[PDB]
Amino acid sequence: QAPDREKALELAMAQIDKNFGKGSVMRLGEEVRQPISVIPTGSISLDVALGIGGLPRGRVIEIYGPESSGKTTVALHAVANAQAAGGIAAFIDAEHALDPEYAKKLGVDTDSLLVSQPDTGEQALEIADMLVRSGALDIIVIDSVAALVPRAEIEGEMGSHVGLQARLMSQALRKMTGALNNSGTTAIFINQLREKIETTTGGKALKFYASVRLDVRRIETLKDGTDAVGNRTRVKVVKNKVSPPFKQAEFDILYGQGISREGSLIDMGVEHGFIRKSGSWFTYEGEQLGQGKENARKFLLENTDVANEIEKKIKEKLG
Numbered sequence: 001q002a003p004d005r006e007k008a009l010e011l012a013m014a015q016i017d018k019n020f021g022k023g024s025v026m027r028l029g030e031e032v033r034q035p036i037s038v039i040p041t042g043s044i045s046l047d048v049a050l051g052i053g054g055l056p057r058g059r060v061i062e063i064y065g066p067e068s069s070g071k072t073t074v075a076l077h078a079v080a081n082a083q084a085a086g087g088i089a090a091f092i093d094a095e096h097a098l099d100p101e102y103a104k105k106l107g108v109d110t111d112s113l114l115v116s117q118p119d120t121g122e123q124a125l126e127i128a129d130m131l132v133r134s135g136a137l138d139i140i141v142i143d144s145v146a147a148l149v150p151r152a153e154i155e156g157e158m159g160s161h162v163g164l165q166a167r168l169m170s171q172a173l174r175k176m177t178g179a180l181n182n183s184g185t186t187a188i189f190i191n192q193l194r195e196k197i198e199t200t201t202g203g204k205a206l207k208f209y210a211s212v213r214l215d216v217r218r219i220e221t222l223k224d225g226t227d228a229v230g231n232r233t234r235v236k237v238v239k240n241k242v243s244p245p246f247k248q249a250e251f252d253i254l255y256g257q258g259i260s261r262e263g264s265l266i267d268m269g270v271e272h273g274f275i276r277k278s279g280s281w282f283t284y285e286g287e288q289l290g291q292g293k294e295n296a297r298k299f300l301l302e303n304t305d306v307a308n309e310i311e312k313k314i315k316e317k318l319g
Helices: 005-020 044-050 071-084 100-106 121-133 165-184 204-209 261-271 293-302 304-316
Strands: 060-064 088-093 114-116 137-143 186-190 212-220 230-240 248-254 275-277 281-284 288-291
Touching: 044 230, 044 248, 044 261, 044 304, 060 071, 060 165, 060 204, 071 088, 071 100, 071 137, 071 186, 071 212, 088 121, 114 121, 121 137, 121 165, 165 186, 165 204, 248 261, 261 275, 261 281, 261 293, 261 304, 288 293, 293 304
Parallel strands: 060 186, 060 212, 088 114, 088 137, 137 186
Antiparallel strands: 212 230, 230 248, 275 281, 281 288
16 A cells, blocks of 8 residues: 555554564664663673663663673673662672672672572572562672573482473573563573574573573684783674664773773774774874774773763764
């Protein structure tokens, strides 16, 4: 028909959102929505890529990717912010491999950070559930969906049987997915890659209960002239029930320092022209920044004023 077509796709599409909620049907192209809620991943890049400006609070988040790629650094950052704004974070640890030292250099108030170390993965989700039911937490993160062996396996007895990881998880995901929505506490899960670049670990559930899934994967070993300053991380938002999916952004995770704010201002500041590069010479309207990416950061690092002007500006150019 003559926008009769468009007019009942709209009717159709509309009821879908009604019947199954909003994220059900989207156009890779619309700008839709904007909650005054959202935790900043700490990368204007990743944020603008998430559409809403950060990890959507209330919904559940899964960050997966190969070892030594970023995941934690992100979540640790994600925690750091939601914390810097009055909220308290709880870290359910089953990988026994955290480093307050790093976390702190990122922004985390470890001191006020709740750390838990379950014995069985079945007890870990309970502690992450009742903890989230008090409605005191803002951001909560289970480190390693893959490290939640069931009370069984860790004991031998009960069962060469099996559906337990993916069960012990679905059990708690459905149960916990509910509260998160009510409580408004965003939950992060660091998952893995057993090879990958896999298909679940016990996933199936998390793959569906999750409202945003990030495919963190290290792309290039950042050179520092000397030997190394960090890494170039690429993140593919492969599922985004809150804004459109399939976007992606990159950032620099400098060793012992974390995701670089300044560095991301450059990248954006140029891909959005607010910063003209004159051939290794990055210049901000008139006055030049510096001579060399890290030369330009150095500058943005010590000059909050301008740097913010760009951050502010880059945001103004999008929202």
